[PDB]
Design a protein around this ligand. Structure first.
Ligand SMILES: Nc1ncnc2c1ncn2[C@@H]1O[C@H](CSCC[C@H](N)C(=O)O)[C@@H](O)[C@H]1O
Ligand SMILES: [Cl-]
Lengths: 265, 265
Protein backbone atom coordinates (compact mmCIF):
# COMPACT_ATOMS: atom_id res chain seq x y z
CA UNK A 1 0.00 0.00 0.00
CA UNK A 2 3.04 2.29 0.13
CA UNK A 3 5.35 3.66 -2.56
CA UNK A 4 8.69 5.28 -1.66
CA UNK A 5 10.44 7.71 -3.99
CA UNK A 6 14.09 7.37 -2.96
CA UNK A 7 16.98 9.50 -4.16
CA UNK A 8 20.30 7.80 -4.87
CA UNK A 9 22.32 10.97 -4.63
CA UNK A 10 25.13 12.36 -6.74
CA UNK A 11 27.79 9.85 -7.75
CA UNK A 12 28.07 6.41 -6.14
CA UNK A 13 26.06 3.86 -4.14
CA UNK A 14 26.99 5.56 -0.85
CA UNK A 15 25.29 8.81 -1.86
CA UNK A 16 21.89 7.44 -0.85
CA UNK A 17 20.86 8.60 2.64
CA UNK A 18 20.82 6.26 5.62
CA UNK A 19 17.03 6.74 5.68
CA UNK A 20 16.83 5.79 2.01
CA UNK A 21 18.93 2.65 2.40
CA UNK A 22 17.07 1.31 5.42
CA UNK A 23 13.67 1.92 3.81
CA UNK A 24 14.76 0.38 0.52
CA UNK A 25 15.95 -2.72 2.40
CA UNK A 26 12.54 -3.19 4.01
CA UNK A 27 10.75 -2.89 0.67
CA UNK A 28 9.32 -5.99 -1.01
CA UNK A 29 10.02 -4.65 -4.49
CA UNK A 30 12.57 -2.13 -5.72
CA UNK A 31 12.45 -0.35 -9.06
CA UNK A 32 14.79 2.27 -10.44
CA UNK A 33 15.22 4.57 -13.41
CA UNK A 34 18.51 5.70 -14.95
CA UNK A 35 17.34 7.84 -17.87
CA UNK A 36 16.94 11.24 -16.20
CA UNK A 37 20.56 10.96 -15.14
CA UNK A 38 23.27 8.37 -14.38
CA UNK A 39 25.32 7.31 -11.37
CA UNK A 40 28.80 7.53 -12.90
CA UNK A 41 30.70 6.39 -9.82
CA UNK A 42 28.99 3.03 -9.37
CA UNK A 43 27.07 0.22 -11.07
CA UNK A 44 23.64 -1.39 -10.87
CA UNK A 45 25.35 -4.42 -9.36
CA UNK A 46 26.98 -2.41 -6.58
CA UNK A 47 23.69 -0.69 -5.78
CA UNK A 48 21.89 -4.05 -5.71
CA UNK A 49 24.57 -5.44 -3.40
CA UNK A 50 24.14 -2.53 -0.99
CA UNK A 51 20.33 -2.68 -1.01
CA UNK A 52 20.36 -6.47 -0.85
CA UNK A 53 17.41 -6.64 -3.23
CA UNK A 54 16.85 -7.36 -6.91
CA UNK A 55 16.42 -4.03 -8.70
CA UNK A 56 14.23 -3.77 -11.78
CA UNK A 57 15.37 -1.02 -14.10
CA UNK A 58 12.66 0.87 -15.96
CA UNK A 59 13.04 2.88 -19.16
CA UNK A 60 11.56 6.30 -19.83
CA UNK A 61 8.64 4.63 -21.60
CA UNK A 62 8.16 2.23 -18.71
CA UNK A 63 7.79 5.17 -16.33
CA UNK A 64 6.18 7.93 -18.42
CA UNK A 65 3.64 5.63 -20.08
CA UNK A 66 3.31 2.57 -17.83
CA UNK A 67 4.13 3.57 -14.26
CA UNK A 68 0.58 2.75 -13.15
CA UNK A 69 0.82 -0.73 -14.70
CA UNK A 70 4.37 -1.71 -13.74
CA UNK A 71 4.94 -0.14 -10.32
CA UNK A 72 1.63 0.89 -8.74
CA UNK A 73 0.00 -2.56 -8.90
CA UNK A 74 2.57 -4.07 -6.55
CA UNK A 75 2.53 -0.90 -4.46
CA UNK A 76 -1.11 -1.66 -3.67
CA UNK A 77 -0.35 -4.76 -1.60
CA UNK A 78 3.36 -4.31 -0.80
CA UNK A 79 6.01 -1.76 0.15
CA UNK A 80 7.60 -0.62 -3.11
CA UNK A 81 10.65 1.55 -3.72
CA UNK A 82 11.38 3.67 -6.78
CA UNK A 83 15.02 4.78 -6.96
CA UNK A 84 16.20 7.76 -9.01
CA UNK A 85 19.61 9.42 -9.24
CA UNK A 86 19.94 12.67 -7.29
CA UNK A 87 16.96 14.02 -5.35
CA UNK A 88 13.53 12.61 -6.29
CA UNK A 89 11.24 15.13 -7.99
CA UNK A 90 13.98 17.45 -9.20
CA UNK A 91 13.43 15.94 -12.67
CA UNK A 92 10.38 17.87 -13.92
CA UNK A 93 8.32 14.77 -14.78
CA UNK A 94 8.64 12.83 -11.51
CA UNK A 95 6.27 14.96 -9.38
CA UNK A 96 3.35 13.92 -11.58
CA UNK A 97 3.97 10.28 -10.66
CA UNK A 98 2.69 11.08 -7.16
CA UNK A 99 -0.64 12.09 -8.69
CA UNK A 100 -0.78 8.72 -10.42
CA UNK A 101 -0.13 7.04 -7.08
CA UNK A 102 -2.92 9.02 -5.41
CA UNK A 103 -5.43 8.02 -8.06
CA UNK A 104 -4.50 4.34 -7.78
CA UNK A 105 -5.19 4.62 -4.05
CA UNK A 106 -1.49 4.30 -3.17
CA UNK A 107 0.28 6.37 -0.51
CA UNK A 108 3.64 7.81 -1.52
CA UNK A 109 6.46 9.32 0.51
CA UNK A 110 9.62 11.06 -0.61
CA UNK A 111 13.07 10.31 0.78
CA UNK A 112 15.47 13.03 -0.39
CA UNK A 113 19.14 12.86 -1.32
CA UNK A 114 21.80 15.33 -2.52
CA UNK A 115 21.07 16.96 -5.88
CA UNK A 116 23.53 18.69 -8.22
CA UNK A 117 21.17 21.67 -7.94
CA UNK A 118 22.38 22.12 -4.34
CA UNK A 119 25.80 20.44 -4.64
CA UNK A 120 27.01 23.32 -6.83
CA UNK A 121 27.43 25.15 -3.56
CA UNK A 122 30.83 23.44 -3.56
CA UNK A 123 31.86 25.89 -6.30
CA UNK A 124 31.94 28.70 -3.73
CA UNK A 125 29.18 30.52 -5.58
CA UNK A 126 26.34 31.71 -3.33
CA UNK A 127 23.27 29.55 -3.81
CA UNK A 128 20.83 32.44 -3.52
CA UNK A 129 22.49 34.06 -6.55
CA UNK A 130 21.60 31.22 -8.92
CA UNK A 131 18.80 32.19 -11.26
CA UNK A 132 16.81 30.13 -13.73
CA UNK A 133 18.44 26.84 -14.73
CA UNK A 134 18.80 25.36 -18.21
CA UNK A 135 19.93 22.32 -20.18
CA UNK A 136 22.45 22.46 -23.02
CA UNK A 137 21.14 20.05 -25.64
CA UNK A 138 23.19 18.57 -28.48
CA UNK A 139 22.01 20.00 -31.78
CA UNK A 140 21.08 17.46 -34.47
CA UNK A 141 19.83 17.51 -38.02
CA UNK A 142 18.34 20.91 -38.83
CA UNK A 143 17.47 21.40 -35.17
CA UNK A 144 19.62 23.91 -33.30
CA UNK A 145 18.03 24.66 -29.90
CA UNK A 146 19.50 27.74 -28.21
CA UNK A 147 17.12 28.65 -25.35
CA UNK A 148 19.81 27.92 -22.75
CA UNK A 149 21.75 30.87 -24.18
CA UNK A 150 18.89 33.25 -23.44
CA UNK A 151 18.63 31.88 -19.90
CA UNK A 152 22.27 32.82 -19.31
CA UNK A 153 21.67 36.30 -20.73
CA UNK A 154 18.63 37.00 -18.57
CA UNK A 155 20.33 35.75 -15.40
CA UNK A 156 23.68 37.44 -15.95
CA UNK A 157 21.80 40.63 -16.82
CA UNK A 158 20.47 40.60 -13.25
CA UNK A 159 23.82 39.63 -11.76
CA UNK A 160 22.71 36.02 -11.26
CA UNK A 161 24.59 32.74 -11.84
CA UNK A 162 23.35 30.21 -14.43
CA UNK A 163 23.51 26.47 -13.72
CA UNK A 164 23.75 24.52 -16.97
CA UNK A 165 22.89 20.83 -17.01
CA UNK A 166 24.75 19.10 -19.83
CA UNK A 167 23.03 16.76 -22.29
CA UNK A 168 23.16 13.03 -21.67
CA UNK A 169 22.21 10.02 -23.77
CA UNK A 170 21.43 7.76 -20.79
CA UNK A 171 20.73 4.62 -22.83
CA UNK A 172 23.84 5.16 -24.97
CA UNK A 173 25.75 6.34 -21.90
CA UNK A 174 27.17 9.32 -23.81
CA UNK A 175 27.98 12.38 -21.66
CA UNK A 176 28.27 15.93 -23.00
CA UNK A 177 31.50 17.46 -21.69
CA UNK A 178 31.93 21.02 -20.45
CA UNK A 179 34.29 21.47 -23.42
CA UNK A 180 31.58 20.55 -25.90
CA UNK A 181 29.13 22.81 -24.08
CA UNK A 182 31.55 25.74 -24.33
CA UNK A 183 32.02 25.10 -28.05
CA UNK A 184 28.25 25.07 -28.56
CA UNK A 185 27.78 28.29 -26.60
CA UNK A 186 30.54 30.00 -28.60
CA UNK A 187 28.79 28.77 -31.73
CA UNK A 188 25.48 30.15 -30.46
CA UNK A 189 27.15 33.45 -29.57
CA UNK A 190 28.57 33.77 -33.06
CA UNK A 191 24.95 33.50 -34.24
CA UNK A 192 23.10 35.83 -31.87
CA UNK A 193 25.90 38.32 -31.24
CA UNK A 194 24.41 39.13 -27.85
CA UNK A 195 27.77 39.42 -26.13
CA UNK A 196 26.72 36.70 -23.69
CA UNK A 197 29.35 33.98 -24.08
CA UNK A 198 32.79 34.72 -25.55
CA UNK A 199 36.44 33.79 -25.07
CA UNK A 200 36.49 36.30 -22.22
CA UNK A 201 33.54 34.84 -20.35
CA UNK A 202 34.32 33.48 -16.89
CA UNK A 203 32.97 29.96 -16.37
CA UNK A 204 33.01 27.29 -13.69
CA UNK A 205 33.23 23.57 -14.31
CA UNK A 206 32.14 21.06 -11.71
CA UNK A 207 32.90 17.42 -12.49
CA UNK A 208 31.92 14.34 -10.54
CA UNK A 209 30.18 16.21 -7.72
CA UNK A 210 29.57 13.82 -4.83
CA UNK A 211 32.91 12.13 -5.42
CA UNK A 212 35.58 12.82 -2.80
CA UNK A 213 37.78 14.15 -5.59
CA UNK A 214 35.54 16.27 -7.80
CA UNK A 215 37.14 18.60 -10.33
CA UNK A 216 36.33 22.24 -9.61
CA UNK A 217 37.76 24.66 -12.14
CA UNK A 218 37.14 28.31 -12.93
CA UNK A 219 38.60 30.45 -15.68
CA UNK A 220 37.96 32.15 -18.99
CA UNK A 221 36.58 30.19 -21.92
CA UNK A 222 39.71 30.78 -24.02
CA UNK A 223 41.77 28.94 -21.39
CA UNK A 224 39.32 26.23 -20.34
CA UNK A 225 37.66 25.26 -23.63
CA UNK A 226 40.31 22.60 -24.30
CA UNK A 227 41.17 21.67 -20.73
CA UNK A 228 40.66 18.11 -19.51
CA UNK A 229 38.21 18.10 -16.61
CA UNK A 230 38.32 14.35 -16.11
CA UNK A 231 35.53 11.80 -16.37
CA UNK A 232 31.86 12.87 -16.50
CA UNK A 233 29.41 13.92 -15.42
CA UNK A 234 30.28 17.56 -16.10
CA UNK A 235 28.21 20.59 -15.13
CA UNK A 236 28.85 24.06 -16.52
CA UNK A 237 28.13 27.30 -14.71
CA UNK A 238 28.25 30.83 -16.09
CA UNK A 239 28.38 33.06 -13.01
CA UNK A 240 27.20 36.64 -12.97
CA UNK A 241 29.05 39.47 -11.23
CA UNK A 242 30.89 37.95 -8.24
CA UNK A 243 30.95 38.83 -4.55
CA UNK A 244 34.59 39.19 -3.48
CA UNK A 245 34.17 36.11 -1.27
CA UNK A 246 32.99 34.01 -4.25
CA UNK A 247 35.94 35.20 -6.33
CA UNK A 248 38.44 34.36 -3.60
CA UNK A 249 37.02 30.86 -3.28
CA UNK A 250 37.29 30.33 -7.04
CA UNK A 251 40.91 31.51 -6.94
CA UNK A 252 41.93 29.58 -3.82
CA UNK A 253 39.92 26.39 -4.34
CA UNK A 254 39.12 26.26 -8.07
CA UNK A 255 42.45 27.58 -9.37
CA UNK A 256 40.86 30.62 -11.00
CA UNK A 257 43.20 33.36 -12.31
CA UNK A 258 43.79 36.34 -10.02
CA UNK A 259 42.37 38.43 -12.85
CA UNK A 260 38.82 37.50 -11.79
CA UNK A 261 39.31 39.45 -8.55
CA UNK A 262 39.35 42.66 -10.57
CA UNK A 263 37.48 41.84 -13.75
CA UNK A 264 34.53 39.88 -12.41
CA UNK A 265 33.87 41.50 -9.04
CA UNK B 1 45.51 15.04 8.52
CA UNK B 2 42.16 16.03 7.00
CA UNK B 3 39.00 18.09 7.57
CA UNK B 4 35.58 16.93 6.35
CA UNK B 5 32.53 19.15 5.87
CA UNK B 6 29.61 16.75 6.21
CA UNK B 7 25.95 17.55 5.73
CA UNK B 8 23.40 15.98 8.06
CA UNK B 9 20.36 16.55 5.91
CA UNK B 10 16.88 17.98 6.34
CA UNK B 11 15.01 16.49 9.30
CA UNK B 12 16.60 13.67 11.33
CA UNK B 13 19.91 11.89 11.89
CA UNK B 14 19.12 9.41 9.14
CA UNK B 15 19.18 12.16 6.50
CA UNK B 16 22.98 11.96 6.46
CA UNK B 17 24.31 10.08 3.41
CA UNK B 18 25.87 6.65 3.85
CA UNK B 19 29.15 8.18 2.67
CA UNK B 20 28.97 10.89 5.31
CA UNK B 21 28.16 8.30 7.97
CA UNK B 22 30.96 5.88 7.17
CA UNK B 23 33.48 8.72 7.03
CA UNK B 24 32.27 10.36 10.26
CA UNK B 25 32.48 7.08 12.18
CA UNK B 26 36.20 6.93 11.40
CA UNK B 27 37.17 10.51 12.29
CA UNK B 28 39.13 11.22 15.47
CA UNK B 29 37.24 14.39 16.33
CA UNK B 30 33.76 15.53 15.36
CA UNK B 31 32.56 19.13 15.60
CA UNK B 32 29.21 20.56 14.51
CA UNK B 33 27.05 23.68 14.35
CA UNK B 34 23.26 23.77 14.59
CA UNK B 35 22.55 27.45 14.09
CA UNK B 36 22.27 27.65 10.28
CA UNK B 37 19.15 25.50 10.25
CA UNK B 38 16.79 23.44 12.38
CA UNK B 39 16.63 19.65 12.28
CA UNK B 40 13.23 19.15 13.92
CA UNK B 41 13.24 15.36 13.92
CA UNK B 42 16.30 14.36 15.97
CA UNK B 43 18.59 15.38 18.86
CA UNK B 44 22.32 15.74 19.47
CA UNK B 45 22.17 12.46 21.37
CA UNK B 46 20.68 10.51 18.49
CA UNK B 47 23.27 11.92 16.10
CA UNK B 48 26.09 11.09 18.51
CA UNK B 49 24.69 7.58 18.94
CA UNK B 50 24.51 6.97 15.19
CA UNK B 51 28.00 8.32 14.54
CA UNK B 52 29.45 6.76 17.68
CA UNK B 53 31.48 9.82 18.65
CA UNK B 54 31.10 12.74 21.03
CA UNK B 55 30.11 15.82 19.06
CA UNK B 56 31.35 19.23 20.14
CA UNK B 57 28.80 21.84 19.19
CA UNK B 58 30.16 25.23 18.14
CA UNK B 59 28.34 28.57 18.23
CA UNK B 60 28.17 31.06 15.38
CA UNK B 61 30.97 33.04 17.04
CA UNK B 62 33.11 29.94 17.56
CA UNK B 63 32.90 29.26 13.83
CA UNK B 64 32.93 32.73 12.29
CA UNK B 65 35.61 34.03 14.64
CA UNK B 66 37.61 31.03 15.84
CA UNK B 67 37.14 28.11 13.43
CA UNK B 68 40.89 28.22 12.72
CA UNK B 69 41.63 28.17 16.47
CA UNK B 70 39.20 25.47 17.55
CA UNK B 71 38.86 23.12 14.58
CA UNK B 72 41.83 23.45 12.21
CA UNK B 73 44.53 22.85 14.83
CA UNK B 74 43.32 19.27 15.33
CA UNK B 75 42.88 18.66 11.60
CA UNK B 76 46.65 18.92 11.20
CA UNK B 77 47.29 15.70 13.13
CA UNK B 78 43.91 13.96 12.92
CA UNK B 79 40.87 13.20 10.79
CA UNK B 80 38.29 15.82 11.76
CA UNK B 81 34.70 16.35 10.67
CA UNK B 82 32.49 19.42 10.84
CA UNK B 83 28.78 18.57 10.73
CA UNK B 84 25.96 20.90 9.67
CA UNK B 85 22.24 20.59 8.96
CA UNK B 86 21.17 20.16 5.33
CA UNK B 87 24.05 20.64 2.89
CA UNK B 88 27.08 22.35 4.51
CA UNK B 89 27.66 24.89 1.73
CA UNK B 90 24.09 25.91 0.93
CA UNK B 91 22.70 29.20 2.26
CA UNK B 92 25.70 29.43 4.61
CA UNK B 93 29.06 31.14 4.62
CA UNK B 94 30.84 27.85 5.38
CA UNK B 95 32.53 27.81 1.93
CA UNK B 96 34.97 30.45 3.13
CA UNK B 97 36.01 28.06 5.89
CA UNK B 98 37.69 25.94 3.22
CA UNK B 99 39.95 28.87 2.39
CA UNK B 100 40.92 29.01 6.07
CA UNK B 101 41.67 25.30 5.91
CA UNK B 102 43.90 25.76 2.86
CA UNK B 103 45.82 28.67 4.35
CA UNK B 104 46.33 26.50 7.44
CA UNK B 105 47.77 23.64 5.41
CA UNK B 106 44.72 21.43 5.95
CA UNK B 107 43.17 19.50 3.04
CA UNK B 108 39.37 19.52 3.13
CA UNK B 109 36.63 17.43 1.56
CA UNK B 110 32.89 17.94 1.25
CA UNK B 111 30.18 15.35 1.70
CA UNK B 112 26.77 16.59 0.55
CA UNK B 113 23.38 15.86 2.15
CA UNK B 114 19.75 16.65 1.20
CA UNK B 115 19.16 20.42 1.03
CA UNK B 116 15.97 22.44 1.34
CA UNK B 117 17.18 24.19 -1.80
CA UNK B 118 16.36 21.09 -3.89
CA UNK B 119 13.85 19.44 -1.56
CA UNK B 120 11.36 22.08 -2.71
CA UNK B 121 10.93 19.80 -5.70
CA UNK B 122 8.37 18.03 -3.54
CA UNK B 123 6.04 21.05 -3.88
CA UNK B 124 5.60 20.03 -7.52
CA UNK B 125 7.09 23.31 -8.79
CA UNK B 126 9.75 22.74 -11.47
CA UNK B 127 13.21 23.22 -10.01
CA UNK B 128 14.55 24.91 -13.14
CA UNK B 129 11.89 27.62 -12.86
CA UNK B 130 13.20 28.85 -9.50
CA UNK B 131 14.97 32.19 -9.75
CA UNK B 132 17.05 34.16 -7.29
CA UNK B 133 16.48 33.08 -3.68
CA UNK B 134 16.17 35.27 -0.59
CA UNK B 135 15.81 35.30 3.16
CA UNK B 136 12.99 36.87 5.17
CA UNK B 137 14.80 38.40 8.14
CA UNK B 138 13.16 39.41 11.41
CA UNK B 139 12.91 43.18 11.78
CA UNK B 140 15.09 44.40 14.67
CA UNK B 141 15.04 47.77 16.38
CA UNK B 142 14.42 50.47 13.78
CA UNK B 143 15.81 48.31 10.98
CA UNK B 144 13.18 46.58 8.84
CA UNK B 145 14.75 44.43 6.04
CA UNK B 146 12.92 44.52 2.70
CA UNK B 147 15.30 43.20 0.01
CA UNK B 148 13.50 39.85 -0.22
CA UNK B 149 10.50 41.78 -1.56
CA UNK B 150 12.44 42.97 -4.59
CA UNK B 151 13.74 39.47 -5.29
CA UNK B 152 10.18 38.21 -5.54
CA UNK B 153 9.25 41.12 -7.81
CA UNK B 154 12.22 40.54 -10.11
CA UNK B 155 11.61 36.77 -10.31
CA UNK B 156 7.84 37.08 -10.82
CA UNK B 157 8.15 39.58 -13.69
CA UNK B 158 10.25 36.86 -15.33
CA UNK B 159 7.75 34.10 -14.58
CA UNK B 160 10.17 32.54 -12.08
CA UNK B 161 9.39 31.00 -8.68
CA UNK B 162 10.90 32.50 -5.54
CA UNK B 163 12.27 30.41 -2.68
CA UNK B 164 12.27 32.28 0.60
CA UNK B 165 14.40 30.96 3.42
CA UNK B 166 12.90 32.01 6.76
CA UNK B 167 14.89 33.61 9.58
CA UNK B 168 16.24 31.71 12.56
CA UNK B 169 17.66 32.72 15.94
CA UNK B 170 19.14 29.43 17.13
CA UNK B 171 20.30 30.73 20.49
CA UNK B 172 16.94 32.40 21.24
CA UNK B 173 15.25 29.27 19.83
CA UNK B 174 13.08 31.38 17.48
CA UNK B 175 12.11 29.96 14.09
CA UNK B 176 10.19 32.22 11.72
CA UNK B 177 6.95 30.62 10.55
CA UNK B 178 5.45 30.94 7.08
CA UNK B 179 2.65 32.89 8.77
CA UNK B 180 5.10 35.44 10.16
CA UNK B 181 6.84 35.66 6.78
CA UNK B 182 3.51 36.40 5.11
CA UNK B 183 2.61 39.07 7.68
CA UNK B 184 5.92 40.86 7.09
CA UNK B 185 5.50 40.71 3.30
CA UNK B 186 2.02 42.24 3.48
CA UNK B 187 3.59 45.14 5.41
CA UNK B 188 6.38 45.65 2.89
CA UNK B 189 3.72 45.60 0.18
CA UNK B 190 1.81 48.40 1.92
CA UNK B 191 5.07 50.31 2.09
CA UNK B 192 6.31 49.81 -1.49
CA UNK B 193 2.95 49.15 -3.17
CA UNK B 194 4.34 47.17 -6.10
CA UNK B 195 1.48 44.71 -6.29
CA UNK B 196 4.02 41.99 -5.56
CA UNK B 197 2.51 40.36 -2.46
CA UNK B 198 -1.18 40.75 -1.57
CA UNK B 199 -4.05 38.75 -0.09
CA UNK B 200 -4.70 37.31 -3.56
CA UNK B 201 -1.14 36.12 -4.13
CA UNK B 202 -0.74 32.36 -4.51
CA UNK B 203 1.88 30.91 -2.17
CA UNK B 204 3.28 27.52 -1.21
CA UNK B 205 4.36 26.38 2.23
CA UNK B 206 6.68 23.48 2.91
CA UNK B 207 7.15 22.53 6.54
CA UNK B 208 9.59 20.01 7.95
CA UNK B 209 10.84 18.81 4.57
CA UNK B 210 12.70 15.54 5.03
CA UNK B 211 10.17 14.02 7.39
CA UNK B 212 7.97 11.31 5.96
CA UNK B 213 4.93 13.57 6.31
CA UNK B 214 5.99 17.13 5.62
CA UNK B 215 3.25 19.73 5.42
CA UNK B 216 2.83 20.88 1.83
CA UNK B 217 0.18 23.55 1.25
CA UNK B 218 -0.72 25.90 -1.59
CA UNK B 219 -3.28 28.69 -1.59
CA UNK B 220 -3.97 32.40 -1.48
CA UNK B 221 -2.36 34.41 1.30
CA UNK B 222 -5.72 35.57 2.63
CA UNK B 223 -6.56 31.91 3.32
CA UNK B 224 -3.20 30.54 4.49
CA UNK B 225 -1.87 33.44 6.55
CA UNK B 226 -3.71 32.14 9.62
CA UNK B 227 -3.34 28.43 8.90
CA UNK B 228 -1.37 26.15 11.22
CA UNK B 229 1.40 24.43 9.26
CA UNK B 230 2.79 22.60 12.27
CA UNK B 231 6.22 22.85 13.87
CA UNK B 232 9.23 24.57 12.24
CA UNK B 233 11.27 24.82 10.15
CA UNK B 234 9.09 26.35 7.44
CA UNK B 235 9.91 27.60 3.99
CA UNK B 236 7.78 29.95 1.91
CA UNK B 237 7.55 29.99 -1.87
CA UNK B 238 5.98 32.57 -4.16
CA UNK B 239 5.36 30.80 -7.50
CA UNK B 240 5.72 32.69 -10.79
CA UNK B 241 3.56 31.77 -13.78
CA UNK B 242 2.64 28.09 -13.46
CA UNK B 243 2.80 25.29 -15.99
CA UNK B 244 -0.42 23.30 -16.04
CA UNK B 245 1.31 20.23 -14.61
CA UNK B 246 2.62 22.31 -11.68
CA UNK B 247 -0.89 23.58 -10.85
CA UNK B 248 -2.12 20.00 -11.22
CA UNK B 249 0.24 18.85 -8.47
CA UNK B 250 -0.47 21.82 -6.19
CA UNK B 251 -4.17 20.99 -6.41
CA UNK B 252 -3.96 17.20 -6.11
CA UNK B 253 -1.16 17.06 -3.54
CA UNK B 254 -0.99 20.38 -1.69
CA UNK B 255 -4.73 21.03 -1.69
CA UNK B 256 -4.64 24.25 -3.70
CA UNK B 257 -7.89 25.88 -4.92
CA UNK B 258 -8.98 24.05 -8.09
CA UNK B 259 -9.32 27.38 -9.84
CA UNK B 260 -5.55 27.69 -10.30
CA UNK B 261 -5.91 24.89 -12.84
CA UNK B 262 -7.30 27.55 -15.18
CA UNK B 263 -3.89 29.04 -15.99
CA UNK B 264 -3.88 32.36 -17.83
CA UNK B 265 -1.65 31.84 -20.87
N1 LIG C 1 13.35 20.57 6.51
C1 LIG C 1 13.10 21.86 6.24
N2 LIG C 1 11.82 22.30 5.98
C2 LIG C 1 11.51 23.59 5.71
N3 LIG C 1 12.44 24.60 5.66
C3 LIG C 1 13.72 24.17 5.91
C4 LIG C 1 14.11 22.89 6.20
N4 LIG C 1 15.53 22.84 6.40
C5 LIG C 1 15.92 24.07 6.24
N5 LIG C 1 14.91 24.97 5.94
C6 LIG C 1 14.86 26.30 5.69
O1 LIG C 1 16.23 26.88 5.51
C7 LIG C 1 16.55 27.79 6.58
C8 LIG C 1 18.07 27.56 6.96
S1 LIG C 1 19.10 28.05 5.62
C9 LIG C 1 20.40 26.75 5.71
C10 LIG C 1 19.98 25.63 4.78
C11 LIG C 1 20.81 24.38 4.72
N6 LIG C 1 22.28 24.52 4.35
C12 LIG C 1 20.19 23.35 3.69
O2 LIG C 1 20.93 22.88 2.80
O3 LIG C 1 18.92 23.06 3.84
C13 LIG C 1 15.58 27.52 7.67
O4 LIG C 1 15.42 28.66 8.51
C14 LIG C 1 14.31 27.13 6.87
O5 LIG C 1 13.54 28.26 6.46
CL1 LIG D 1 23.16 40.27 -4.47
Amino acid sequence: MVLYFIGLGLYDERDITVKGLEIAKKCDYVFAEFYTSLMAGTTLGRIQKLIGKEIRVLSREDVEQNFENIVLPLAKENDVAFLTPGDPLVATTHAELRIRAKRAGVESYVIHAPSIYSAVGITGLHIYKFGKSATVAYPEGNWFPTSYYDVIKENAERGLHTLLFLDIKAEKRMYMTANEAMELLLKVEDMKKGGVFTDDTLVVVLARAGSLNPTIRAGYVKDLIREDFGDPPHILIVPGKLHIVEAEYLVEIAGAPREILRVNV
